[PDB]
Design a protein around this ligand. Structure first.
Ligand SMILES: [Ca+2]
Length: 42
């Protein structure tokens, strides 16, 4: 399959680091992410 990054069911990546985080912190308004990608348009 050729892959490295991996997350859980209710989780999603951020940006460069691709840090996986819980949907609970999606489109909310926090820099919790590693690259603040969660707050880049939402
Ligand atoms: Ca967040």
């Amino acid at each position: 399959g050729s892959q490295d990054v991996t997350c859980s069911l209710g989780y999603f990546p951020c940006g460069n680091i691709t840090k996986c985080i819980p949907q609970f912190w999606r489109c909310d308004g926090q820099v919790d992410c590693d690259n603040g990608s969660d707050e880049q348009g939402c």
